[PDB]
Amino acid sequence: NRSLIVTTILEEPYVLFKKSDKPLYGNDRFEGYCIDLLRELSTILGFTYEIRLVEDGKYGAQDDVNGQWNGMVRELIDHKADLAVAPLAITYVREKVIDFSKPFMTLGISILYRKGTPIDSADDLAKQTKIEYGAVEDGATMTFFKKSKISTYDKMWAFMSSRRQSVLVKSNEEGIQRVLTSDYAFLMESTTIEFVTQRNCNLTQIGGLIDSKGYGVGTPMGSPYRDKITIAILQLQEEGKLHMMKEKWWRGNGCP
């Protein structure tokens, strides 16, 4: 029964500040899917924890000049947190430097856009330059296009790469706003798209999932929590609890 430090990041509906008229204290300031998941994990494993929002505000990417990591990944590497419980994508490059639990949610990159247009796939966007499109700078989604040898997606990356300053945004809050107020398609993880489209009733996911990945709890390399967390996740999945938590948090405010 250690007391752990858990790093996480603000992103609805995984983690948000709980609405209140007066200051809330400590872990009580937060709510969301990942907050509920962290509570269920602590019940099973028997630990208390302090939630600390990641200090530099980032998920985790590697500086290609100096090799250094940032974000929640770096916090784990440096043993500044015990666990990262967030919508943090399990990717090849990250799994090499930290230990992820098995996934608690499965998803893929897709496209956020306006409802009734001729666009129907990544190919449709890749073909033309008239409708702009991008992703959040330095997330797994942007990293995917940058590294992809796949035809359409190297082509999409050229468009993005040569327009880094315009089409790449700094957050999801900013991407969504750009979709809503300009002619722009936002490349984004499908779970987040599904939350957005149950709120902004004039937006939609375009096409299928472009790839496949999961979110996992991050731990430092070698951590004894990693396997215990994987086993607790499997228990919660088999009890129906992960599904119930997803329904709780994605229950859109009634989108006609």
Ligand X SMILES: N[C@@H](C[C@@H](C/C=C/c1ccc(/N=N/c2ccccc2)cc1)C(=O)O)C(=O)O
92-99, Cβ contacts within 8 angstroms, sequence gap of 24 or more:
93/62, 93/143, 94/60, 94/218, 97/69, 97/73, 97/221, 98/73, 98/218, 98/219, 98/220, 98/221, 99/218, 99/219, 99/220, 99/221, 99/222, 99/223, 99/226
- The least CB distance from residue 137 to ligand X, in Å, is 7
- The least CB distance from residue 135 to ligand X, in Å, is 6
Residue set of the binding site for L-glutamate: 87, 89, 94, 140-141, 189
* Partner whose footprint covers residue 95, from a second copy, ligand X, none (CB < 5 to 8 Å by kind): a second copy
Residues with Cβ within 8 Å of 89's Cβ and at least 6 positions away in sequence, in order, are 59, 139, 140, 189, 213, 214, 215
Comparing CB distances to a second copy, the nearer of 11 and 99 is: 99
Comparing CB distances to a second copy, the nearer of 64 and 238 is: 238
Among 36, 58, 225, 232, binds ligand X (CB under 6 A): 58
Contacts of ligand X in 124-163 (CB under 6 A): 136, 138-142
In three-state secondary structure terms, 197 is helix
Instruction: Give, as one character, the DSSP assignment of residue 47.
Output: -
DSSP states of 97-159: TEEEPSPSEEE-EEEEEESSSS--SHHHHHH-SSSEEE-BTTSHHHHHHHH--SHHHHHHHHH
* Partner whose footprint covers residue 243, from ligand X, a second copy, none (CB < 5 to 8 Å by kind): a second copy
Contacts of a second copy in 88-107 (CB under 8 A): 90-92, 95-96, 99-100, 102-103, 106
By CB under 8 A, residue 120 contacts a second copy? no
By CB under 6 A, residue 188 contacts ligand X? yes
28, two tokens: 């009580």
Binding span for a second copy by CB under 8 A among 68-76, 154-162, 198-206, 227-235: 227-235
- The least CB distance from residue 93 to a second copy, in Å, is 9
By CB under 6 A, residue 100 contacts ligand X? no
Instruction: Give, as one character, the DSSP assignment of residue 19.
Output: P
- The least CB distance from residue 72 to a second copy, in Å, is 18
Q: Which residues would be at the binding site for ligand X (CB under 6 A)?
A: 57-59, 87-89, 136, 138-142, 171-172, 188-189
